[PDB]
């Protein structure tokens, strides 16, 4: 996260970290949607151009973490994965269209003050909240600047405005689709901020003005550089892929 700030403790209890077991490597972010299911970006698990194709046994997730420079005994929890499910039409060859994956935990995680699931949007939520100019929040342990420390110890948070689709489309030569949305400040708007490499899979959340609940509207997916004027970060449109999520969980 570039130009963000340290998160307050417990501010994002659905935050999940995805790790490679060996060697130890923090790969991406993710989010908790129930006591047994975690949502993330497909490219964090499968990306042939970078020789990436993880199986359940290669990974683990850490839930309930705040700081990397402290072992949060009996608060943070490590969980093993039972099964990974990548969207069948995830387009890794071109533009990361449908960059989404679900991971089922071997055992349910116990909720606590630091571990709690985020809501997934329904039709009414997507129609009311996913609008240009409205701001959402992105969180992660990814790069603090466009590069390659440079990685934070404490979870970073940044609020960013959703951008009009035509502006998103004209900002890049990569083909955008209805399964994505973009966010970020425009040049000279007075503020900066962006997700960055390492933040993929992390949630873009919005708070409902009607019921006080947080809804995960997007998943950090891609960008070109980080925080550059005139460029915007792209996110998987979670509601657009809701039917697939439900299908996978209903059938497991």
């Amino acid at each position: 996260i570039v130009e963000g700030s340290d998160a307050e403790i417990g501010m994002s209890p659905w935050q999940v970290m995805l790790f490679r077991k060996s060697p130890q490597e923090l790969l991406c972010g993710a989010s908790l949607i129930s006591d047994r299911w975690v949502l993330t970006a497909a490219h964090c698990l499968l990306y042939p151009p970078w020789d990436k194709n993880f199986t359940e046994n290669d990974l683990l997730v850490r839930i309930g973490k705040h700081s990397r420079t402290r072992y949060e005994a009996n608060i943070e929890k490590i969980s093993m994965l039972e099964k990974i499910y990548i969207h069948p039409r995830y387009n890794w060859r071109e533009n990361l269209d449908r960059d989404i994956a679900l991971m089922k935990l071997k055992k349910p995680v116990a909720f606590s003050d630091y571990i709690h699931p985020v809501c997934l949007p329904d039709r009414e939520t997507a129609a009311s909240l996913l609008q240009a100019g409205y701001k959402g929040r992105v969180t992660g342990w990814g790069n603090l600047k466009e590069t390659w420390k440079g990685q934070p110890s404490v979870l970073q948070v940044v609020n960013l405005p959703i951008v009009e689709r035509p502006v998103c489309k004209d900002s890049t030569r990569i083909r955008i689709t209805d399964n994505m949305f973009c966010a970020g400040y425009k040049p000279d708007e007075g503020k900066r901020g962006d997700a960055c490499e390492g933040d993929s899979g992390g949630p873009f959340v919005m708070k409902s003005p009607f019921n006080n609940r947080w809804y995960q509207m997007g998943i950090v997916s891609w960008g070109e550089g980080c925080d550059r004027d005139g460029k915007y970060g792209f996110y998987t449109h979670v509601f657009r892929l809701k039917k697939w999520i439900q299908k996978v969980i209903d059938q497991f």
Partner: peptide
């Protein structure tokens, strides 16, 4: 929706986090 999206240390305690009001205000601006 059960208890989804209501944070134990914030919504559940009627406590606001430091920047969520920026999000609520963005629904106007």
């Amino acid at each position: 929706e059960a208890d989804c999206g209501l944070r134990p240390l914030f919504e559940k305690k009627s406590l606001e986090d430091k920047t969520e009001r920026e999000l609520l205000e963005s629904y106007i601006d």
